[PDB]
Design a protein around this ligand. Structure first.
Ligand SMILES: *[C@@H]1O[C@H](CO)[C@@H](O[C@@H]2O[C@H](CO)[C@@H](O[C@@H]3O[C@H](CO)[C@@H](O[C@@H]4O[C@H](CO)[C@@H](O)[C@H](O)[C@H]4NC(C)=O)[C@H](O)[C@H]3NC(C)=O)[C@H](O)[C@H]2NC(C)=O)[C@H](O)[C@H]1NC(C)=O
Ligand SMILES: *[C@@H]1O[C@H](CO)[C@@H](O[C@@H]2O[C@H](CO)[C@@H](O)[C@H](O)[C@H]2NC(C)=O)[C@H](O)[C@H]1NC(C)=O
Ligand SMILES: *[C@@H]1O[C@H](CO)[C@@H](O)[C@H](O)[C@H]1NC(C)=O
Ligand SMILES: [Ca+2]
Ligand SMILES: [Ca+2]
Lengths: 948, 991
C-alpha cells in the first residue's frame, strides 16, 4: 500500500500533465487573447430578463387574441346562418354540393379538388373549399346530415376570410352535434376509422363545464356474464371522456358499497388515475344481492366530502345496472332534496328485467336514461350525457361564450403538437320572437382553431442567449405548454405488456429536476403573478448521464389574455451577449470565403448550425448539402438581405472569421501532436471546426451548438470537463476517437464575464494509457473516474476494453462503498416519454427511472477499507485538481472471494411512482373559476325512455 | 271427508309458487323470490301435520314418497343437495292425491315389461359401436389448424381437424381440446357410449361423421356410421313399436244447406288471401267482408258440427269486439269456422267414411286427456329439476342461450324441445359447460339422457293408447331388362361440372345406342298392340323426350338440359318388368288410397294453422343486420361489426328471416318444416321476438307466442302422424360337453370384453403393456380352446356349425393380427393392417345371447326379411332417382363455407349426392340444404369447354322447394310402408 503523500504527488503529476497538454493544444488562451484584441467587429448588449419575458408574453397574447377573434367571427356567423333555415325534407331535386373526405350517391354531389402542396402542412391541401368528415356509423344522405351539410356550407366564406386575414392559420374546424366535422382547408382524411368529433377533447371541453363524476357499478350476481364485460367496457369508454379538469371515482355495490381501487375519494382524473381506475374496474367479479340504498348513500357521501381538492361543479352519478324493482325513493328524498346532483342510469346487456325504477330515478333527478345492449352502442351512448350537462351553459347565453384552450395533444391530421381554441355554438332559431325554448337547450356544435407549438416557439427566440437559458410556459394545472424536455411523443404510464387519443400532459416538476424552490416557483406561477428568483440548483445534462450544479435566475410573468404563465430561465454569464455591428461587404466576403468544403484542408472540417436564417434556405438534416446551400446563398443573395434576418448571419460570419484565424495562426503551427488526436472548437455562432479534417468523419455530434451536451457541461463548469465515450459499440470512436475534453472560453470586455465558445481536444487513449503505465498488475488496479462514475481506464488492461462504462457495472462493491461514504451523490428521476420494449404477460411508451451520479463534497482525499466479508479491501482516493476527474486505487478483487449485486446506471424501465398515496398529497393546482349548472329555466322533462 | 280437497288445493298452490320464482346467477335473488321463501314453513307445516294424522291410524309407495318429501323439507330449514327432494318432487304427489291418475299411471307402467327387455338390446347394440369406434377413433381428433401468425389462434368457426388430411388453405394444427369443446369424441368407453347414443337419435351424427371424415379419410367412416343409423335406430324404433303392439293385440232443406255451404267457402277464401304488403283497397274490402260475414253468421244462428259451428261463429263476435277497444295484435278465431269443410262430404259421397274418421278422431282424442295431464306433470317435474340444476348457470361470456332454465317458462320450453328431440345435444353441451366443462361437468349428461329416453317412452305409450281405442271405433326379357340396368348405371357415372370431358365423350354414344334400343322396342310394339285398342304412356313419353333431345341437340345451354332430366325415369320401367316389385308398388298405392281420407283433414287443419300463423306474425319477421336499427328507413349505410371479437366495416341490410309467415304458402312451408322437426327451435326464437308489423325484433318481447307451437306440436305430430300408422294397422288385420369347460369359456370371454373396453387416450405406458399382454394371453387361450375342439371333434366336422365356424375364423384372424402387430422389418407403413381388429371387437358378437337376447326381440327373432323386406328395393330406387336428379340440377353449384353446400355436403358426385340424401332423410338441416340449393348461386368453374363468358348463367334452381319437400314426403311414406310390411312379416309370430 503506497503512502498517501506519494499517491498525492503522482496524482499531481498526472493532473499537471493533462491540464498543460489540454491548455497548450486546445488553445483557449489564444482564443481569449484574439477575442479581447478585436473588440471592434461586435458590441455587447444586455439581455434584461424582465423585458424579454414581457415581450414574449405580449406576443403570445396577441397570437391567442387573433385566434379568439377568428373563433368569435366563425361562431357568430354560424349562429346567424343556422337561425335562418328551412329544414327541407327532400334533397333529390336540390342536391348538396360538398367534398367528403376519405373517398377514393343520391342526395348529394361530390367535389374533385386540385390538392396542391402547401407549406406549414405536411400533407396536400386545397384552399377552394372545406372538407367534411362523416363517421362510419353515421350514414350521409339522411335528413339530419343533409340539412347539416346544407346549412354549414355557408362557413366556407368565413373560413377563407379568416385565412386571408391571418395567412399563418392552421386547421379551423366546426364539430357538429350531428357527428360530422367540417374543417378548412380541405384535405383527405388519414384500417377501420374510429374517429368521432364528439369524443375529441376540445369538443368535450367546449360542450360542457368541468364535472365531479362518480360512477356506481352494480356487481351483483345477476350482472355476471356478457353484461359484466359490457359494463366494464362502458366504464372504460366513459372514463375516456374525462379531462384533467374533471374529478372522478369508481364505486361498486352488492349488498355493500366499496371503492374498486385504492383512492377512496375523488381524484384528479389525469392519465395515471384513469389508468389505475381502468385496471381496477377490469378486475371485478359479480356476486351477491343488489342493494341500491347502500350504494346510493355511499355515492352521495363521497360527493359531499370537500376535504379534498375538487371541481366544485357538476356533480353527476353514473349508475351502471341491468334492472330491478327497488326505487330507493327515501335515499333521493334524503340527500338531494333540492336536486343538486344529476343521476344518469344505464341499462347494460340483453335482459328482460324491469327498467321502470331505473328510468324513474334517471329522470327524476335532472338526469337521463341510456341503454347499452351490445358493444356497438358503447361508443355512442357513453358520450351523450354532455347534451344534458350543457343545458345551463346554453341557457346562460352570451356569458357562456369564452375561448378555452386544451392541453398539448398530438394532432389527429398528423401536424405535430398543437393546442386548440374552443367556442360553443348555440341553436338560436326562434329567438327573434322568443317562443320555442324547446330544442334551443342543445348546442349546435363546437368551433375550434389549431395553434401549433412551433408558432409559439417562433415567438420566443433563443439564439440571443446562452444554450443553458430557455423559456417555458405553464398551465393552471402545472403542465408545460413549451419546454426543452417536451417531445412529440405520448407520455407513458405503467408497463408495456402485450399478450393520438390521450394528450401530452407533462408537469413542470417532471420536465426537470424537482426542488423546494422549484415547487415554490411553480405555485407562484400557477395562480398568476410576476416575480424573480435567483438561486443555486443542480441541472441534468442533455444526455441522461451527468448532473451539474449551476446558478439560475427565474423570471416569470402571466400572459394577460389567458391563464398561461411564461417564465424565462437564464443563468449567470448570460445577461450580456455578443451582437456584431458591421455593414461593409468586403469583411463579410473575407469571412465567408473560409466556408466552402473544398477549402477545408488548410482550415479544418467545418460544420454549420441548421438555424432558420430565412425562408428561402431549406433545412435538410444532412449538413453536407446544407452548408453548400448556405454558402452558395451567401455568395448569391445580395448583402442587403431584404428577407433574411441579418443578426444570425452576422454572428455566424464573425464567428467563422474568429475560428478561421485561430486555426491559421495557432493550430497550423503544430500540425500533429503525439498525444492529441483531434482539436475542435464550438462557438455560439453555430460552427464546429475540427483541425484534423480527417477526424471529421468521427465527429458524431449534433451540428447545432445549442444541442451539444458537452457545450452546456463546459459552460456550467469552471474547470476542464471530461466526457466519457459510449459503450457496447454504439458507433465508431471507442479507440479511434479518444477521451474528449473541453474548456469554456471566458471573456472580459469591460469587466463583464462572457462565454462565447468552448475549445477542447480528443486525447488519444493509447498515449494517455502509456503515460499512466509509466500494467496488467494482478495485485492492484488504479482507475480514473469522472463526474458520474464512468470509467476512463484502469491498470488491468481488461477494464480498458470496456471503455466508458459505469464503474458499478464492473466493480459494484467499490462503487457502493464510494456512494456510502458520501463521495458520490445520486438523484433519480422519471422519464415519462421514453420508448420501451414490450414485455410478456412494435414498441410502446412507458415510464423509465433515470439515475445520475455526481460529486457530493468538496473534499479531495478519500481513504478507507472496504469490508466485503472475511477480507480486507484497502483503498485510497484522490481527485485531480482543476478538472472533473477522480483517481482511486484499490486492491485486486480476486484476493477476496466476494461478489455483490452489480450497480447499473442506465435507462431502467419501471412503473412508479405509486399513485395511491400520490393523491393523498396532490400537487397544488387552480381550477376554472366559471361554472354553469343549476338553472331554473332548464326543462329536464325528457327522460331517456319516454322518447323510446 | 273434504280434508283431502284442502290438501289438493295446498298442493296446487305450492306448485303455483314453485312456478313463480326464478334463479339468478352467483347467489343473487330477486325481491319477489324473498316473499316466496317467506312462506316455506306454512306449506310444510300441514305437510308435516298430515303425516301425523295418517300415522296415528295407519301405523304403499306414495306415503313413502310424501314422508321422504316432508323429512327432507324439515331438515332443509335447519341450515344444499337436500333442497331438491322436497321441491321438484312435490308436484308428483298430486298423483297420489287422486285415484284416477293413480290408475292411469298403472296403465302405462304395466306396458313397460316387454319394453324394458327390448331396451336392453339397444344398450347392448350401443355397446358394440362404442367398442368398435373406440379402437378406431381414439385420440385422433385433437389437431385443429389455427395458424393466426398474429394471435396464434382463430381459424374456422367450425374447427377443421387435420388428422392425416391436411388443411387446404395452409395453416398448421397444434393440440385441440376437441370437437364440441372436447365432449364429442371417442376417448374412453364412457365418452364413446355417449357419442354413439347421441348419434343413434339422429342428432348431430353428420357433424360427428364429418369430424372423423377429414381426420382419417372419406373411405370407411360411412361403413361405421350408416349401419349405426340403420341397424341402430331404424331397427330399434321399429322393434319398440312392434313389441308395444304385442301386448295391445292379445233449415232442413238441401238448397239452404248448399247455399250455406257455398257461403262458408268464401269466408275461408277471404282469410286465405291476407298477406303482407297487400293493397289498401284489399284491406278495406276485407274489413267490410269480415263484418258482413259475421253479421250474416249471427243472423243465420238466430234463424237456426253444430256445436263446433256454434262457438266459432259466436267467438268471432267476441274477438272482433275485444280487439276493437285495443288496436294492435289480432290472434284470429274466425278461421275456426272452416271446420264445416268436413260436413261437405255428403254431396261428394264418402260421407260415412268421414263420419267414421271423425268419430275415431274424437274418441281417440279424449282417450288421452288423463294421460296428457299425467304427461304434463312429468314435464313440470323435469322442468323444476332442470331449474334446480342449471338455473342461473347459462350466463356465459358470449350471452345466455335462448334454451335456458332461468325462468319457469324457459325451462318448460327447453324440456319440451328436448322431448321433441331436436337439438337436445346442444342443450346437453350447454349443461355440461355450465356444470364445469368436460373436466368435471360430465355428470349432467345423465339428466338429458334420462329425459331423452322418456321422450320416446312418451310417444310410445300415447301411440299405444290411440290404437287400443281405435279398435273400439272399428265397429328375350333378360336382355331388355339388363339394358335398363346398364343405362341406369351409365346415368350415375357423370360429372355435372365438366360438361365436355372424356367420360361424357364416351357416354354420349352409349346413351345414343340406349335410345336406339329403346326406340327399337318402341317400333316392335306398335304392330302387336296396334297403338290403342298405365305406365306404357310413361315409357312413350320417355322415348319421345329422348328423341326430341336428340332432334334439337344437332339455346343448348339451359333449354336442352330440362329435356335431359326425363331420362332419369329409366329405373322406373323396371317396376313393370319385375312382378315382385309390381306387388310392392301396388301395396304402396293401395296403402296411400286407404289413408288418403285422413290426409284431407290433416291438410285442412294445416291450412287453418297456417292462416292463424299468417295473421299472428305476417311481416314481423323482418330484421336489420345491426341490432341498433329498428326499421328499414334507418337500416341504411355502413356500420362497424364487432362480431367474433374482430372489428370490421359492413353495410346495413334490411333482410328477412329465411322461414316466415308473409303468405299462406310461406306459412305452409314453414309449418311443414316445423312438423318435420328440424329448425323449429330457431323458428320459435324468431317468433317470440316479434314486436310490430314493420319493426325490428327485440329479444323475448312476447313469450306467449310459444303457446302456438305447443298446440301445434301436441296436435299435428303427436296425434295425427300416429293416426296414420294406427289406422293402416286397423285396415291391416284383414289380408367339450363338460360343464366346467363350457362355463369357463363363457366366463373367460366376459373378461376379454371387459379388457376390450378399457383402452383410452393418454394412458400410461405400463397400462398399454398390460393391455397388450392380456390380449396376447386371451388369444393364446382361444387358440388352445380351438385346437382342443379340433382334436376332440375332427377337423372336417369342426366347421359343421355356423357359430363354430365364426369362432374359428376369429381365432385364426386373432393369431394373424397378434403376429403382424409386433412384426419387425415388415412394418409397411403404407400397408397399415387394421381390419383384423374387427375380429377382436367381434368376440363379443359371440359372447352375447347367453340366454336368448335375439328371441327377446320380435322383428329380429321372427323372420325379418321373409318377403316384406322387398320394399327396401323400392326405397333404394327412390334414392337413386333423386340422387341423379340432384346431380343433374344442383351439381354445378360452387362450393363455399358458411353454407350447407360445401366440400362435406354437395351434389358433385353420385356418392356425395347419396350421402346428402341420406342426411336429409334422417334429417339434419335439410331446410338449410334446400335454402343453399336455390337460384342465383355461384357456379363451379368449367375448365373444359373454353368460352369467353365467366358468369354466363347462375347455377342453382328455384325448384329446390318441390324437390326436397317431395323427397322427404316420399321417404316418410315409404318408411311407414316398410314398418307395416315388417308387421306383415311378424303377424304369425305375435299371434
Ligand atoms: C335548432 O332548433 C330548431 C327548433 O328550435 C330545430 O328545428 C326543428 O327541426 C325539427 C326536425 O328535426 C322540425 O320537426 C318537424 O316536426 C315533426 C317533428 O320532427 C316532424 O314530423 C315527424 O315527427 C316524428 C316524431 O314526432 C319524426 O319521427 C318524423 O321523422 C317527422 N317527419 C315525418 C313523419 O315526415 C316534421 O316532419 C318536422 N318538419 C319537417 C319539415 O321535417 C321542427 O319543426 C323544427 N322547428 C322549427 C321551429 O323549425 C333545428 O333542427 C335545430 N337545429 C339543429 C341543427 O338540429
Ligand atoms: C340550402 O339548400 C337550398 C336548396 O338547395 C339553397 O337554396 C338555393 O340556393 C341557390 C344558391 O344561392 C339559389 O340559387 C336558389 O334559388 C336557392 N333556392 C332553391 C334552390 O330553392 C340554400 O342556399 C341552402 N342553404 C345554404 C345555407 O347554403
Ligand atoms: C395577429 O397577431 C400579430 C402578432 O402576433 C399582430 O401583429 C397582428 O396585428 C394580428 N392580426 C393580424 C391580422 O395579423
Ligand atoms: Ca341484481
Ligand atoms: Ca335435428
Amino acid at each position: 500500500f503506497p503512502s498517501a503523500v506519494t499517491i498525492k504527488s503522482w496524482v499531481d503529476k498526472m493532473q499537471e500533465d493533462l491540464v498543460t497538454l489540454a491548455k497548450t493544444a486546445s488553445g483557449v488562451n489564444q482564443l481569449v487573447d484574439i477575442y479581447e484584441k478585436y473588440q471592434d467587429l461586435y458590441t455587447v448588449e444586455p439581455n434584461n430578463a424582465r423585458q424579454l419575458v414581457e415581450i414574449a408574453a405580449r406576443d403570445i397574447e396577441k397570437l391567442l387574441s387573433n385566434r379568439s377573434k377568428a373563433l368569435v367571427r366563425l361562431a357568430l356567423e354560424a349562429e346567424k346562418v343556422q337561425a335562418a333555415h328551412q329544414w327541407r325534407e327532400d334533397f333529390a331535386s336540390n342536391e348538396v354540393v360538398y367534398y367528403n373526405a376519405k373517398d377514393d350517391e343520391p342526395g348529394s354531389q361530390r367535389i374533385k379538388p386540385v390538392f396542391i402542396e402547401d407549406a406549414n402542412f405536411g400533407r396536400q391541401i386545397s384552399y377552394q373549399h372545406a372538407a367534411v368528415h362523416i363517421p362510419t356509423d353515421i350514414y350521409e344522405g339522411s335528413t339530419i346530415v343533409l340539412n347539416e351539410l346544407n346549412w354549414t356550407s355557408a362557413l366556407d366564406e368565413v373560413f377563407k376570410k379568416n385565412r386571408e386575414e391571418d395567412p399563418s392559420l392552421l386547421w379551423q374546424v366546426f364539430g357538429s352535434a350531428t357527428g360530422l366535422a367540417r374543417y378548412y382547408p380541405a384535405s383527405p382524411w388519414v384500417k377501420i376509422d374510429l374517429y368521432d368529433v364528439r369524443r375529441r377533447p376540445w369538443y368535450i371541453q367546449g360542450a360542457a363545464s368541468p364535472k365531479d363524476m362518480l360512477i356506481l357499478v352494480d356487481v351483483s350476481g345477476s350482472v355476471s356474464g356478457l353484461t359484466l364485460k359490457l359494463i366494464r367496457t362502458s366504464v372504460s369508454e366513459m372514463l375516456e371522456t374525462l379531462s384533467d379538469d374533471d374529478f372522478v371515482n369508481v364505486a361498486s355495490f352488492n349488498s355493500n358499497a366499496q371503492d374498486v381501487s385504492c383512492f377512496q375519494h375523488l381524484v384528479q382524473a389525469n392519465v395515471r388515475n384513469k389508468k389505475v381506475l381502468k385496471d381496477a374496474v377490469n378486475n371485478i367479479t359479480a356476486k351477491g344481492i343488489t342493494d341500491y340504498k347502500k350504494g346510493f348513500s355511499f355515492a352521495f357521501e363521497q360527493l359531499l366530502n370537500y376535504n379534498v381538492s375538487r371541481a366544485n361543479c357538476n356533480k353527476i352519478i353514473m349508475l351502471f345496472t341491468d334492472g330491478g324493482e327497488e326505487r330507493a325513493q327515501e335515499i333521493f328524498n334524503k340527500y338531494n332534496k333540492d336536486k343538486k346532483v344529476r343521476v344518469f342510469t344505464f341499462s347494460v346487456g340483453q335482459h328482460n328485467y324491469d327498467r321502470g325504477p331505473i328510468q324513474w330515478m334517471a329522470c327524476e333527478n335532472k338526469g337521463y336514461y341510456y341503454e347499452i345492449p351490445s358493444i356497438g352502442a358503447i361508443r355512442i351512448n357513453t358520450q351523450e350525457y354532455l347534451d344534458v350537462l350543457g343545458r345551463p351553459m346554453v341557457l346562460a347565453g352570451d356569458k357562456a361564450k369564452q375561448v378555452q384552450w386544451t392541453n398539448v395533444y398530438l394532432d389527429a391530421l398528423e401536424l405535430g403538437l398543437v393546442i386548440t381554441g374552443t367556442l360553443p355554438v348555440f341553436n338560436i332559431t326562434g329567438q327573434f320572437e322568443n317562443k320555442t325554448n324547446l330544442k334551443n337547450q342543445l348546442i349546435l356544435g363546437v368551433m375550434g382553431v389549431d395553434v401549433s407549438l412551433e408558432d409559439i416557439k417562433r415567438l420566443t427566440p433563443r439564439f440571443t442567449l446562452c444554450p443553458n437559458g430557455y423559456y417555458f410556459a405553464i398551465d393552471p394545472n402545472g403542465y408545460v405548454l413549451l419546454h426543452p424536455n417536451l417531445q412529440p411523443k405520448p407520455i407513458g404510464v405503467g408497463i408495456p405488456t402485450i399478450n393520438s387519443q390521450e394528450p401530452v400532459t407533462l408537469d413542470f416538476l417532471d420536465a426537470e429536476l424537482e426542488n423546494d424552490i422549484k415547487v415554490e416557483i411553480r405555485n407562484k406561477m400557477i395562480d398568476g403573478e410576476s416575480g424573480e428568483k435567483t438561486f443555486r440548483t443542480l441541472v441534468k445534462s442533455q444526455d441522461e448521464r451527468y448532473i451539474d450544479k449551476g446558478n439560475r435566475t427565474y423570471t416569470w410573468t402571466p400572459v394577460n389574455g389567458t391563464d398561461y404563465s411564461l417564465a424565462l430561465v437564464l443563468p449567470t454569464y448570460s445577461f450580456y451577449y455578443i451582437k456584431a455591428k458591421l455593414e461593409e461587404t468586403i469583411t463579410q466576403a473575407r469571412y465567408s470565403e473560409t466556408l466552402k468544403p473544398d477549402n477545408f484542408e488548410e482550415s479544418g472540417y467545418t460544420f454549420i448550425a441548421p438555424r432558420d436564417y430565412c425562408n428561402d434556405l431549406k433545412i435538410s438534416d444532412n449538413n453536407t448539402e446544407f452548408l453548400l446551400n448556405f454558402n452558395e446563398f451567401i455568395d448569391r443573395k445580395t448583402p442587403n438581405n431584404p428577407s433574411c434576418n441579418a443578426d444570425l448571419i452576422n454572428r455566424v460570419l464573425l464567428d467563422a472569421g474568429f475560428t478561421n484565424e485561430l486555426v491559421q495562426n495557432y493550430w497550423s503551427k503544430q500540425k500533429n501532436i503525439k498525444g492529441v488526436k483531434a482539436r475542435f472548437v464550438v462557438t455560439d455562432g453555430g460552427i464546429t471546426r475540427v483541425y484534423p479534417k480527417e477526424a471529421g468523419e468521427n465527429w458524431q455530434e449534433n451540428p447545432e451548438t445549442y444541442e451539444d451536451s458537452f457545450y452546456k457541461r463546459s459552460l456550467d463548469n469552471d474547470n476542464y470537463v471530461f466526457t466519457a465515450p459510449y459503450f457496447n459499440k454504439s458507433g465508431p470512436g471507442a479507440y479511434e476517437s479518444g477521451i474528449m475534453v473541453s474548456k469554456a472560453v471566458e471573456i472580459y470586455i469591460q469587466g463583464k464575464l462572457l462565454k462565447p465558445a468552448v475549445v477542447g481536444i480528443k486525447i488519444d487513449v493509447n498515449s494517455w494509457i502509456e503515460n499512466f503505465t509509466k500494467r496488467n498488475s494482478d495485485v492492484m488496479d488504479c482507475v480514473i473516474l469522472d463526474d458520474g462514475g464512468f470509467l476512463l481506464m484502469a491498470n488491468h488492461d481488461d477494464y480498458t476494453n470496456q471503455i466508458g462504462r459505469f464503474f458499478g457495472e464492473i466493480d459494484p462493491s467499490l462503487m457502493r462503498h464510494l456512494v456510502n461514504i458520501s463521495v458520490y451523490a445520486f438523484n433519480k428521476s422519471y422519464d415519462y416519454q421514453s420508448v420501451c420494449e414490450p414485455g410478456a404477460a412494435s414498441k410502446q411508451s412507458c415510464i423509465t427511472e433515470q439515475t445520475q451520479y455526481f460529486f457530493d463534497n468538496d473534499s479531495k482525499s478519500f481513504s478507507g477499507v472496504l469490508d466485503c466479508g472475511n477480507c480486507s479491501r484497502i483503498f485510497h482516493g484522490e481527485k485531480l485538481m482543476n478538472t472533473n476527474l477522480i483517481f482511486i486505487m484499490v486492491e485486486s478483487k480476486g484476493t477476496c472471494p466476494c461478489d455483490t449485486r452489480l450497480l447499473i446506471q442506465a435507462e431502467q424501465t419501471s412503473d412508479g411512482p405509486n399513485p395511491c398515496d400520490m393523491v393523498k398529497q396532490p400537487r397544488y393546482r387552480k381550477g376554472p373559476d366559471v361554472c354553469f349548472d343549476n338553472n331554473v329555466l332548464e326543462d329536464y322533462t325528457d327522460c331517456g325512455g319516454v322518447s323510446g | 271427508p273434504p280434508f283431502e280437497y284442502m290438501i289438493l288445493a295446498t298442493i296446487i298452490a305450492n306448485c303455483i309458487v314453485l312456478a313463480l320464482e326464478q334463479h339468478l346467477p352467483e347467489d343473487d335473488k330477486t325481491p319477489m323470490s324473498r316473499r316466496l321463501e317467506k312462506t316455506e314453513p306454512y306449506f310444510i307445516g300441514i305437510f308435516c301435520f298430515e303425516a301425523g294424522i295418517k300415522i296415528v291410524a295407519l301405523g304403499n309407495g306414495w306415503n313413502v314418497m310424501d314422508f321422504i318429501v316432508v323429512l327432507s323439507g324439515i331438515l332443509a330449514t335447519a341450515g344444499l343437495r337436500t333442497l331438491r327432494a322436497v321441491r321438484v318432487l312435490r308436484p308428483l304427489k298430486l298423483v297420489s292425491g287422486i285415484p284416477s291418475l293413480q290408475i292411469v299411471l298403472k296403465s302405462i307402467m304395466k306396458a313397460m315389461v316387454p319394453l324394458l327387455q327390448i331396451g336392453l338390446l339397444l344398450f347392448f347394440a350401443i355397446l358394440m359401436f362404442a367398442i368398435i369406434g373406440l379402437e378406431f377413433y381414439s385420440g385422433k381428433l385433437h389437431r385443429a389448424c389455427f395458424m393466426n401468425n398474429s394471435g396464434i389462434l382463430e381459424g374456422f368457426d367450425p374447427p377443421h381437424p387435420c388428422g392425416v388430411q391436411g388443411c387446404p388453405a395452409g395453416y398448421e394444427c397444434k393440440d385441440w381440446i376437441g370437437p364440441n369443446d372436447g365432449i364429442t369424441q371417442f376417448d374412453n368407453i364412457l365418452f364413446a357410449v355417449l357419442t354413439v347414443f347421441q348419434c343413434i337419435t339422429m342428432e348431430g351424427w353428420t357433424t360427428v361423421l364429418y369430424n372423423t371424415n377429414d381426420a382419417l379419410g372419406a373411405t370407411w367412416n360411412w361403413l361405421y356410421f350408416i349401419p349405426l343409423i340403420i341397424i341402430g335406430s331404424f331397427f330399434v324404433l321399429n322393434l319398440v313399436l312392434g313389441v308395444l303392439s304385442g301386448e295391445f293385440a292379445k233449415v232442413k232443406s238441401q238448397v239452404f244447406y248448399w247455399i250455406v255451404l257455398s257461403l262458408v267457402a268464401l269466408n275461408t277464401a277471404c282469410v286465405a288471401i291476407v298477406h303482407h304488403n297487400q293493397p289498401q283497397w284489399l284491406t278495406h274490402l276485407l274489413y267490410y267482408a269480415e263484418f258482413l260475414f259475421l253479421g250474416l253468421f249471427l243472423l243465420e244462428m238466430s234463424l237456426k258440427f253444430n256445436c263446433f259451428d256454434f262457438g266459432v261463429t259466436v267467438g268471432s263476435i267476441f274477438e272482433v269486439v275485444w280487439a276493437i277497444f285495443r288496436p294492435g295484435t289480432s290472434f284470429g278465431i274466425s278461421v275456426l269456422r272452416a271446420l264445416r269443410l268436413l260436413r261437405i262430404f255428403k254431396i261428394t259421397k264418402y260421407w260415412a267414411s268421414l263420419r267414421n274418421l271423425v268419430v275415431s278422431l274424437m274418441s281417440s282424442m279424449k282417450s288421452i286427456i288423463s294421460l296428457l295431464f299425467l304427461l304434463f306433470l312429468f314435464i313440470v317435474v323435469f322442468a323444476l329439476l332442470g331449474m334446480q340444476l342449471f338455473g342461473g348457470r347459462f350466463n356465459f361470456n358470449d350471452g345466455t342461450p335462448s334454451a335456458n332454465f332461468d325462468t319457469f317458462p324457459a325451462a318448460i320450453m327447453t324440456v319440451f324441445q328436448i322431448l321433441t328431440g331436436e337439438d337436445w345435444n346442444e342443450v346437453m353441451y350447454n349443461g355440461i359447460r355450465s356444470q364445469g366443462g368436460v373436466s368435471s361437468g360430465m355428470w349432467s349428461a345423465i339428466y338429458f339422457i334420462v329425459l331423452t329416453l322418456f321422450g320416446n317412452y312418451t310417444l310410445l305409450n300415447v301411440f299405444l293408447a290411440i290404437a287400443v281405442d281405435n279398435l273400439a271405433n272399428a265397429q328375350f326379357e333378360m336382355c331388355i331388362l339388363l339394358v335398363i340396368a346398364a343405362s341406369s348405371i351409365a346415368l350415375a357415372a357423370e360429372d355435372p361440372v365438366l360438361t365436355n370431358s372424356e367420360r361424357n365423350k364416351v357416354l354420349r354414344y352409349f346413351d345414343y345406342v340406349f335410345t336406339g334400343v329403346f326406340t327399337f322396342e318402341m317400333v316392335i310394339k306398335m304392330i302387336d298392340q296396334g297403338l290403342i285398342l298405365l305406365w306404357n304412356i310413361l315409357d312413350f313419353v320417355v322415348v319421345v323426350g329422348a328423341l326430341v333431345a336428340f332432334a334439337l341437340a344437332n339455346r343448348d345451354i339451359k333449354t336442352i338440359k330440362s329435356l335431359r332430366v326425363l331420362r332419369v325415369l329409366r329405373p322406373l320401367k323396371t317396376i313393370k318388368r319385375l312382378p315382385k316389385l309390381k306387388a310392392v308398388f301396388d301395396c304402396v298405392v293401395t296403402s296411400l288410397k286407404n289413408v288418403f281420407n285422413i290426409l284431407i283433414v290433416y291438410k285442412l287443419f294445416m291450412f287453418i294453422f297456417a292462416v292463424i300463423a299468417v295473421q299472428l306474425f305476417k311481416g314481423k319477421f323482418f330484421y336489420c343486420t345491426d341490432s341498433s336499427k329498428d326499421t328499414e328507413k334507418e337500416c341504411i349505410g355502413n356500420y362497424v361489426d364487432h362480431e367474433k371479437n374482430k372489428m370490421e366495416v359492413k353495410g346495413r341490410e334490411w333482410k328477412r328471416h329465411e322461414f316466415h309467415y308473409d303468405n299462406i304458402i310461406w306459412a305452409l312451408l314453414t309449418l311443414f318444416t316445423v312438423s318435420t322437426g328440424e329448425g323449429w327451435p330457431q323458428v320459435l326464437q324468431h317468433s317470440v321476438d316479434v314486436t310490430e308489423e314493420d319493426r325490428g325484433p327485440s329479444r323475448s318481447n312476447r313469450m306467449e307466442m310459444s303457446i302456438f307451437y305447443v298446440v301445434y306440436f301436441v296436435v299435428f305430430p303427436f296425434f295425427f302422424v300416429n293416426i296414420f300408422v294406427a289406422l293402416i294397422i286397423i285396415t291391416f288385420q284383414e289380408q367339450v360337453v363338460s360343464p366346467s369347460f363350457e362355463y369357463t369359456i363363457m366366463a373367460m370371454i366376459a373378461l376379454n370384453t371387459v379388457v376390450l373396453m378399457m383402452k383410452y387416450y393418454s394412458a400410461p405406458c405400463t397400462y398399454e403393456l398390460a393391455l397388450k399382454y392380456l390380449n396376447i394371453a386371451f388369444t393364446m387361450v382361444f387358440s388352445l380352446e380351438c385346437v382342443l375342439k379340433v382334436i376332440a371333434f375332427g377337423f372336417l366336422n369342426y366347421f359343421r356349425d355356423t357359430w363354430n365356424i365364426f369362432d374359428f375364423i376369429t381365432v385364426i384372424g386373432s393369431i394373424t393380427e397378434i403376429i403382424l402387430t409386433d412384426s419387425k422389418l415388415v412394418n409397411t407403413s403404407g400397408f397399415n393392417m387394421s381390419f383384423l381388429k374387427l375380429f377382436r371387437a367381434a368376440r363379443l358378437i359371440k359372447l352375447l345371447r347367453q340366454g336368448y337376447t335375439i328371441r327377446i326381440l320380435l322383428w329380429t327373432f321372427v323372420q325379418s326379411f321373409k318377403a316384406l323386406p322387398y320394399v327396401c328395393l323400392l326405397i333404394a330406387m327412390l334414392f337413386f332417382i333423386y340422387a341423379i336428379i340432384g346431380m343433374q340440377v344442383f351439381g354445378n353449384i360452387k362450393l363455399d363455407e358458411e353454407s350447407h353446400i360445401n366440400r362435406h355436403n354437395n351434389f358433385r358426385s353420385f356418392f356425395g349426392s347419396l350421402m346428402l340424401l341420406f342426411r336429409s332423410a334422417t334429417g339434419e338441416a335439410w331446410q338449410e340444404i334446400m335454402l343453399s340449393c336455390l337460384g342465383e348461386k355461384g357456379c363451379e368453374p368449367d375448365t373444359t369447354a373454353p368460352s369467353g363468358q365467366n358468369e354466363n348463367e347462375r347455377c342453382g334452381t328455384d325448384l329446390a322447394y318441390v324437390y326436397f319437400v317431395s323427397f322427404i314426403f316420399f321417404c316418410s311414406f315409404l318408411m311407414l310402408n316398410l314398418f307395416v310390411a315388417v308387421i306383415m312379416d311378424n303377424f304369425e309370430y305375435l299371434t
